[PDB]
Design a protein around this nucleic acid. Sequence first.
DNA 1: TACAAAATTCCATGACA
DNA 2: ATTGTCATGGAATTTTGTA
DNA 3: TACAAAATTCCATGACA
DNA 4: ATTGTCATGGAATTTTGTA
Lengths: 163, 163, 365, 365
Amino acid sequence: DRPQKPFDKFFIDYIGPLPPSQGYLYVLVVVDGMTGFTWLYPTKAPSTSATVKSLNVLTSIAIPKVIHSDQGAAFTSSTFAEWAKERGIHLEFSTPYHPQSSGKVERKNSDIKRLLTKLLVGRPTKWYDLLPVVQLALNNTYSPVLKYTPHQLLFGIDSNTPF
Amino acid sequence: DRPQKPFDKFFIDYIGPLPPSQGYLYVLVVVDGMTGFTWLYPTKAPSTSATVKSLNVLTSIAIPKVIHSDQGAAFTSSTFAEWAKERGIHLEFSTPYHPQSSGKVERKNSDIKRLLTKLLVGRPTKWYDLLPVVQLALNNTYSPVLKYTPHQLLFGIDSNTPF
Amino acid sequence: AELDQLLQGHYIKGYPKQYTYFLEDGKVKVSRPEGVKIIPPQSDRQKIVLQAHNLAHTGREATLLKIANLYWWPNMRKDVVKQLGRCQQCLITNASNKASGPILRPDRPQKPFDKFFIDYIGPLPPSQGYLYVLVVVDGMTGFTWLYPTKAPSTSATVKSLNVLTSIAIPKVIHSDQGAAFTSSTFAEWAKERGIHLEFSTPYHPQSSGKVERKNSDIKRLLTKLLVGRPTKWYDLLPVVQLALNNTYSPVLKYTPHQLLFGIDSNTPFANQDTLDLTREEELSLLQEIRTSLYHPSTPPASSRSWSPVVGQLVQERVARPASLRPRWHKPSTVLKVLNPRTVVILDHLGNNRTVSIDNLKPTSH
Amino acid sequence: AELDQLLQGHYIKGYPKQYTYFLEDGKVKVSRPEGVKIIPPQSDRQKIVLQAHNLAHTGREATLLKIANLYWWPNMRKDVVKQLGRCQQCLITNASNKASGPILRPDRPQKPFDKFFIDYIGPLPPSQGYLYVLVVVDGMTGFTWLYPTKAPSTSATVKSLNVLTSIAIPKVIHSDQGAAFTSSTFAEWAKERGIHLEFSTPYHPQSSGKVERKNSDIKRLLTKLLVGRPTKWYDLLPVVQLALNNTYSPVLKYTPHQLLFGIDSNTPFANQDTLDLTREEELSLLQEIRTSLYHPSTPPASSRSWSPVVGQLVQERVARPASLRPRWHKPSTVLKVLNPRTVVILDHLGNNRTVSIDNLKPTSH
DNA sequence: TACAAAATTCCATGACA
DNA sequence: ATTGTCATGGAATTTTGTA
DNA sequence: TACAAAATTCCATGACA
DNA sequence: ATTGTCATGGAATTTTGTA
Ligand SMILES: [Zn+2]
Ligand SMILES: [Zn+2]
């Protein structure tokens, strides 16, 4: 009803498996519905557990009202269901096979995979150390609509590392 | 020239040898010329050394202008002579054989030996522990002249242990 | 139940009319200047305050600001304060924001030997096998005896004071409640000689202030002599003792020695003013000096001080507080007020403790 | 030589006539109200003052009272003060009696991420193998990140801040000169990312005051949650972090989170005042909030404060002073006054040190 | 009945636990 | 059941030598 | 245009090193 | 080269509901 805001919705997805870096295989991807801000967490499995351990990190900063995801076994589990009921997060699922996000999220989530591939090649074994440099680049990347970096929309100032 | 005062003169003498108490054999005796106050220190020998070690204890409280003694080997030594020149104490010696004190000191120094004997007998091995009780009794003992205890003349108040 | 009448526009004590009270989602709501707030029912309100508080156990104002986001009701703070008073955890953990009233300046003892103050310094660097110094100050004169010891033990305290009381016997010996003096062996040694033992409230060195202050000077002088040299303090004690007993207090304009004896011994720069008086004239000039001495008065109370009332709720500081555990004990009642700075409390739970207010805080709320 | 003329009754500048100056024992003497005092010759006077002083290294007044027993001469104190100024020992041992001037309240950083303050808490009781907490506070917002570590090591600081700077990169990180941050490995990590390192003057935690103050609250809350329970703090850090970042400062009337993000997340009692504004209206209402924040000013100077002049003689407090050794270093010159509370000194001897005046005293005399 | 400087007193500051 | 203390050295105040 | 009480602000106090 | 901070809960002050 009212205008879209940060923390209204968090779109989550798993990327992988990738060539093992530092004993990790997967990247959990969390994009903010409204701003396009992106968190990335390396996991060892697309398991409920790995998701919860990861999302405990994120929810020490901020808790979303809604998490949107596909019907992946990890997110459909009742452990994950209970986790989110505790923190008072509403869970929301896309249809099987027809996985829909925001127009802006689809755009963003595509950017990530391509950016990951470009920088995987050449150093496929060493992608772990790069996740911060990646995360930083995405969030300070100019959006064709609004011409605001996700950073700017989240914090309401300019960053000290532009691109 | 001017009226007699505390710390003007210290009369010193050795009593002994006595039956060994706590490995001690001698009592060094220091009486104040003016007040009759008495210090007693147990020594192991009537040596210069034992005297100096003992008198270092006394001179942390007060230093006399003059020390009077007989021509005992301990006090005629040049070590003792140097000790007293340092602290700026004048040494004064009685004639050999004709040992003179103050009228009051002779009186007092006699009291000590008799008091020591009365309390030696019965517990001749245990006189060390008693030296304080002795010292206390002497100094709070009424003088026929002045009717002031040595304590009173030294401190200018009454003691908390009268006799 | 009581919020029925309100929606209809009937007045209720505490609910300001002029604001319209309406209904949505089966919750009672109100339009207020600040915004539109939910008014919870009576029974729900304690539950709410508690939840808000428990987020990070915040005080009055912090806890309210949370609540006031969603809710409104009459006299909100009153309810908040009620909880903060019953929070076991905040009570025993939060610090005080009220300082104790102004200190007392107990009258200087009248005569020398009326009162001795005693304490151990150390441990120090081992000198000649000795580690501690027993320090004994005469209350009246500030005269001081020093005895090197190997332990702050009753045993050694007794050895040392036996030599001391060969000079004279005090009426009262005042010490801290350190093991060396609170032993039953010491009490007896003391009883035998007719000496009354007297102890500072626990963990309050200010009460032993006369010794403690003298501890400072002993150390400061030792320090000055030991510059350059290795720390051979054993041989120095006597010199220090003597040096200190013969130093002027610029306020008194007298040395401890002078106050004790009434004439200077044969020390350097010995005062000769009373050289013509008989000992007797001198000894009464002394009594005159001793009663005329400067005596300090108590300072003004700070803006936000407190003082102990009988029956007040009160909390004692945890003595040796373990890492991450509360800095205060549970609440205690004041039983008697021995003086404006000393108190008897019914404790944990419950014995009588005598404590300084410096180790106390008023339970708030 | 100069005291010849005097006995004859001829005037000398500084020797008040009306008192008769006579001779005894081949010393010049004078009858004064106080009594009859020996007047030593010029050359002997330094020797005298020194002897009097050295008895127990006493100050002006104490040292004079000794001397004035036996002697008199013109402007006695002037001579005493001259010695006390040249006493190596008193200088480096005596405490100060002048307090440092009023503290500065440095302007709050303008934007979030302008400045980070960082510090380690601990050691704590071992929880899950961890002993220390790295604490990171954003200067502007007071937002705080917590990271459990096994050591206050550069190694672990880097690991932890790599996760942190995935969110954003600060301009400036301010820390104390603890080994973990003064390492060359840290300087490089920082250089790579274009972060300026900035250090507090040595042994002055007040400069890291923002973190240090936050250290307090972290500990106080952990404490409250851990009452009754054993000290399992590892699992609690997140909750604490979150709880604290979302707590109101009654002075600001905002939570760190709010200042950082400009809206509340989905936490309990989340504020809804800006629910109708577009993100854009909101984001500028935020910029308005951030510049309007309460900023404290410096307090009045105490009666007896001092402030550093260029070329002043000045002494730095001995950092970890050994038992019985001087609490102060030898004298140092002030080189530049970086601000009324910070100073560059030419030291021991001699490098440039940048120090807080709280670790300074004015060499007296 | 008065002045400049010395001599004395005042007293905040800090350290002992 | 008990209780703060006092050296120190600039500054403030009072006394002093001389008129 | 004025009141009593509530709501808000003030701010000394203490603890982080 | 750099620099104190701020929760807390009585008290003091200002605002509020009603007249
Ligand atoms: Zn609480
Ligand atoms: Zn000196």
